[PDB]
RNA sequence: AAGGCGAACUUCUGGGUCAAGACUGACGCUGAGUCACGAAAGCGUAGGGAGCAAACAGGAUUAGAUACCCUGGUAGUCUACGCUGUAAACGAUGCACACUUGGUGUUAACUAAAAGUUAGUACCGAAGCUAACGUGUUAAGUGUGCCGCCUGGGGAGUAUG
RNA sequence: GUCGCUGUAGCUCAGUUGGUAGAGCAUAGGACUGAAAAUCCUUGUGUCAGGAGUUCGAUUCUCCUCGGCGACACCA
């Protein structure tokens, strides 16, 4: 209720391999059990494997584009007026965009069938790069579910 | 029969702003929402009673606030 | 779910036990499909009985009722009637649409 | 007024009217 | 394949549905569309967005009747009647007049009774 | 007078208000029985019946729904005549007269009009009154005339006539 | 015996004068409500009854059957 939350930490723009905040955030979302080193190693190895499965030098480029292929635009939030619940569409914010994307890739990769760690996650990452797989399917499902219910778009309060 | 003739160079936006305003100044929509379904003359009279009482209390209230200040 | 009748400092006549059951079949036509548990605690403390009924609803509502009386049959009648009425009231709360 | 007294009168009137309706058409 | 040039567009916008008819100046109907026909159902049928879609679909139905010159007629209290006119404008077909034919009785035909007696 | 009375016109017809503007000269007030009128619903006879709508039917909500909601729908709602004479028929305050500070609107008349008066009609409010709420020149204030009505609650506006 | 026809998703129904295998209901999953409902969304469900021929290829075009049809005429 007392809004305007305190300024986020935001200071962890990982100064290890890329000086990029988005990789750090992805590793953090990856974490189980409180094991940052394990997450960092898995993510680094997996993105390397992706960059040599697509054989480009710049790994930032392919990683970022495979993220942006899943970052959504409009999502469904439920409100209710007059004892009637309506699933109104609403435009997400950019931070929530990265969050939803990373969550979707992570869930699909974890629940997929694979042999090993970076194996599962690199495979899922290139599927996203090629705009196909569970993560992209979920993203497009959310997109056009919101679009199939655009009538209530005038409820944005 | 409320009309708004649209000129050759006139813009659609203000055209239907004029339409909306003179509709509201004919009170067509309020009349229709009033005639949607029947009301006892008793309850018309009573709601007018109560509306005027609310108006009087609100005015006395407003003047009290003005003098209190 | 089926109701849990507990007692403290007292001994259950089978008459009063199946009396309680006979008062509780009122729930399993209307309310049973809406509740998690229904507990009925009897206590005998001051030459009198103290009854605590308790119900949990599937939508997060909790109903409690405490009563005292002198005669177990009368106390059970009043307390179970109050419990059933309050449960009906909450069900209607939610189903009013 | 509290209105309980008016309610009492109302239920009395209903019972009396019901009695008369019951005993109508009887002869 | 015919050319009319002039025409009328009737729009009924009630609390439940929106119906858009495209007709001659004489009034003979060329085509029509409705929110119920546009796939909506339930409360969607009366939102302004559905009114916009219904109207523009109705006009797209009649793109090739050689008309660019319409009189708009409106009745009903529906929320998005302005949206219906706005979409008619957005399609590019120019309007020459906007009217209302909402029937206002002189106190006849006692209306329905209230809800929740 | 109350119930009540709102598209337009005519005919028939009731009542009120003001005045120097003359006449009668207390011819008045109230009124037990009695008589007349009396919303809506209902009844009899004969018409009419668009819309609305008890009863009733179907569809939903619900454990059930003889209801609230939805789709239909017969009386009734309307007209003429003859009955019924009941309402929270209320201002929950009977009628009439003689008096008792003001404020703010409003209707009609007299005045060319303002400005004021008179007869109404609303809000606020001094004193007074009131158990309190409130009332307060349209008293529930100060006085009286006459009529109606009340004497703890239930039984009971019942039983019986 | 004859005439008019059909058989396509679990059901109903399209199917284009030949190059699609789908529409609605239902099934299963996600989301929504407190559940049941109703949206909303995904998702399966085929030698298109069988065979021959026509076509470069055939649910479709023809023909021959299989099973089920509706309707008509005889019935010693």
Automatic annotation (TrEMBL), chain C:
Q: Which Gene3D superfamilies match?
A: Ribosome hibernation promotion factor-like
One Pfam family name is Ribosomal_S30AE
Q: InterPro entries from the entry?
A: RHF-like (IPR036567), RHF/RaiA (IPR003489)
User: This chain belongs to which protein, by name?
Assistant: Ribosomal subunit interface protein
Specify the species: Borreliella burgdorferi (strain ATCC 35210 / DSM 4680 / CIP 102532 / B31)
Q: What is the lineage of its organism?
A: Bacteria, Pseudomonadati, Spirochaetota, Spirochaetia, Spirochaetales
